[PDB]
Amino acid sequence: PYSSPPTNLRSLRDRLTQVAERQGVVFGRLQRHVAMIVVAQFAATLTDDTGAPLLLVKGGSSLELRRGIPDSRTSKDFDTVARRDIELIHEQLADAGETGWEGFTAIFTAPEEIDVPGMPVKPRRFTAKLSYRGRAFATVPIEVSSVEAGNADQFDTLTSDALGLVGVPAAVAVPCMTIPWQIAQKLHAVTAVLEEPKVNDRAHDLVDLQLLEGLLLDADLMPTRSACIAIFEARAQHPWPPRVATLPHWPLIYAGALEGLDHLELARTVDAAAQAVQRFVARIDRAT
């Protein structure tokens, strides 16, 4: 029961060590979750002049927020979508970082762009260098993409009590892309055919797509169908509905992506994962 925040970086890490052992989790994982939460709190301070989020969390960080550390893949990336524009995001986050949150501060590396076919405006990558009460704490790779169709019309707001458990009580509340659009974008990515020297390595999306299907539960799959149509049309690459092929090097990638998830009811082989996701494609495609 911590009565006050950690005094310095050394005390922070001792508490994280204690919580990680209490919860049966690897320290490095809890530590990197905390760093993503800190970054997310900076991003949640970014609003338009109505108070609406400028940045929505997506990708593996989002799944780790939705499912919890035990029930999600280890994510290294903090992926986000910018609701309004992307060049103003970098300077707004750096101000957020300098201003700080609960003792944490951040400095952000310069934004490099990326070529992605199908996206007129290009994603950006940079890095957050986090400090606690002066002493460097962790580094978080950040990617920012522009909005595509209605993938930023709405957002879910997710939380974590990880910082509470080490005596940082401030509320955590993170705006995230909704599940229909996460499914649409991961379905597109895992079935994408890459340019000759490039090769699709995204077998891990087969894990995430099973985890996201579990979370739609019995919901109408019609918002997910409309999101899939929109993404696949917006990107103007392979058509909807796609075929979930597996590539020759994917078996071990998929196995690597299953690490730590033995307790979940997931396909245990990449073939069965492809079969599971294909059935999910067909179910989404029948939802009118």
Residue numbers in the entry: 4 to 291
Excerpt from the publication:
The Mycobacterium tuberculosis NTase toxin family, MenT, modifies tRNAs to block translation. Our study reveals a conserved mechanism for the control of tuberculosis toxins, and demonstrates how active site auto-phosphorylation can regulate the activity of widespread NTases.
Structural alignment of respective protein backbones returned an RMSD of 0.144 Å (268 atoms), and there was some small movement of the S78 loop, leading to occlusion of the active site by the phosphoserine (SEP), albeit to a lesser extent than we observed for MenT1-p. Using the solved crystal structure of MenT3 as a starting model, we performed MD simulations of ATP and Mg2+ binding in the absence and presence of MenA3 to establish whether a conformational change to the S78-bearing loop ensued. In the absence of antitoxin, R76 and K79 stabilize the γ-phosphate of ATP, which lies 10.0 Å from the sidechain of S78. When docked to the Alphafold-predicted MenA3:MenT3 heterodimer used to run the simulations (pTM score 0.84), the looped region of MenA3 connecting α5-β4, spanning residues H98-I108, forces MenT3 S78 into an inwards-facing conformation akin to binding of MenA1 to MenT1. As a result, the overall distance between S78 and the terminal phosphate of ATP is reduced to 3.1 Å. We therefore conclude that regulation of MenT1 and MenT3 NTases occurs by antitoxin-induced toxin auto-phosphorylation.
